Write a structure and sequence with these properties.
part of a larger assembly; 3 chains; A: 330 residues; 17 helices; 58% helix; C: 116 residues; mainly beta; 40% strand; globular; antiviral protein; Phage defense proteins; SIR2 family protein
Amino acid sequence: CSIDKIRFGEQEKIEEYLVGIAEEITKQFSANGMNVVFYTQFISEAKAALYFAKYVKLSEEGLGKIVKALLFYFPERDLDIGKRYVWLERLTKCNELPKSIISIIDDFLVLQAEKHIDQNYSEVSSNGLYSRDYGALIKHFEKNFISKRLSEITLCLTQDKQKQIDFLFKLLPLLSTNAKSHLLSFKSVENINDLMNGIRIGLIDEFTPEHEELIIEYLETRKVNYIGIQTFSSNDYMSTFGIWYFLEEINNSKMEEFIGMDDQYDFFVDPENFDYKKFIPSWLKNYNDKLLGKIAGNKHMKHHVIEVLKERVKNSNDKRYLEILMNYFI
Amino acid sequence: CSIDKIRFGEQEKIEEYLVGIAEEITKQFNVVFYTQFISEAKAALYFAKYVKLSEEGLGKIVKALLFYFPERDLDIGKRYVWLERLTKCNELPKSIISIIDDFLVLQAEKHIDEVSSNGLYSRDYGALIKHFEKNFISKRLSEITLCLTQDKQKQIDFLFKLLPLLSTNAKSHLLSFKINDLMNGIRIGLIDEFTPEHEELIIEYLETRKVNYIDYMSTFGIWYFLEEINNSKMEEFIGMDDQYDFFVDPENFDYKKFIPSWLKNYNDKLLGKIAGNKHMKHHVIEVLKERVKNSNDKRYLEILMNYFI
Amino acid sequence: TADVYFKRKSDGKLVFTAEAQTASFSQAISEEKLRKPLYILKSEKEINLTVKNAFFDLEWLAMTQRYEVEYRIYIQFPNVSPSGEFEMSLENGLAPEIKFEALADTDTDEMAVVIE
């Protein structure tokens, strides 16, 4: 059930509750390690409280202390960076971002920049969301912030620490102009992962021939490594090339040789012979307003999409499928 | 859940159990045992809609719920619901038609002196009779139709609803004895194509409505939409009410006065005719989507996922 | 009725065995409004595994005073992490369940691989 409909009364009392629990966790992590039995008894309650904290409006000092506790003074073994990030997104859902929490997120991502000294050490998140999404949220809710400490760090950045280079790459919008130039001095587009890293940070606005040759090289590599035994993976790059082709942003009709080894690839390129029996409705979930408008406008499969849409919405009770069919009538 | 879709195994014992239940209810005609046996029997015969059963056993069940079941617990409309549920999965050969005809003449003898909460009576029994193997004649109903004295109104009135089940010679007496006249006759099926006198009566009734202007009137409009009346004069008779304006003109009818409840009264065939007409498509889909997103009633959603009006 | 071989990343030592009961494949989207620009196909990929019974290796507990698993045709699943939740019950207790979820690294961008 949509729990956003419920009304929250006496926000002050719950605010004090979370202030107290955040103080407790900060005191716990701050010194002497932890009390093992008390930690095992209390960590789940703390995590649940911070999770449910999304629906309560919080005072400035309130959510400031709460976010500082959630990021800094929380042991790393329970929530990785991705769960911490989505947790932050939830608790910022209700409350718009003031200057203070920008200071907090900035200096914590500074310590993150400090962490990636060992090349063996790489940040890991269960949900696949990392500090680049942090930088995305500063850009979203601030739109003009320029970091000082990160710019200073990348100014004294050399060729040795590759992890520093490809970390500062993913947060380039936060980097200053001179910082950006210093970072791109040693940075070149080598593989695909770098390619959509630069795309996501916003450097790339169109596919110059370098990106085209890189993606077709990856396509040749996957065609080579497919051929006797095969293994399923969840890298979601080939579907990205398919959605690129359907959007007509790309204009190289050379990858049509790559029909067959996966679904959700040929449906954006050659939907007329996609053999709709293998269509998984979950595809419709991943796209957005613009892509949904596009596949609504294509009209060569819209009947099939509406058939699977009504079938799923009748069989399922997710109540999101009704939204997706109702908004654009695909 | 779609209990029809889920498959069933071990049909032999299942039909043996149904046959045994039918035999027990037949031999019943001690009430304290009946008090709990009746619920089990009703549940069994109701939910047996989805099970394939052999011919002879099917006959046993149809006889069992046709005669021996009293009216206190199983009503005539519920009797219809049960038997049509049974017939959904398996189509009945001649024998079951014979038993239901015998029960119909049993009802004819009963009416010498009929309550359904759903309001289903013997006329739609005759409707189901005529739905399949249309070439059928009720011989017993025929000879009791030949003997229709003018004094006994109840039997003729009840049999009036059973028009198509009689023969020409049998129905001759019924048509000899038997705007309301026209609509009940077309509803039962006394006349299928409207004679000129019929649309003349319709036009004079509409003219009286006009002279009173400055409730079977919507039937004329929904007849226009189906192209059943071709007098070519009712286009001069627009404006008495919103629904008539809807049927008689697609674009002249202003769309803000539409009431979606009329769509809940629309049957499948004419709703599909509306969908395929394409003349009112935009406004009907607009009101349909508005009702779906704004009302909890789920008849609209089935409207859309079946017909796309 | 499928067995579970949970083993170390660094070496081939087997941490334990088990018989998994359920796998959650919760792949969906994040909040659309808060997350012309080139399309990236955002997703909230999440995979979790839950098992009811586990037999513990004697060697690990012998010298123990980022892993991976094989589920059995048979599917390897690397880069995993246990989840440490335990609440005790008034009733004496008995089967040791455990949950481990999918830890996704930045470079690989894929989490599930299958072999046959």
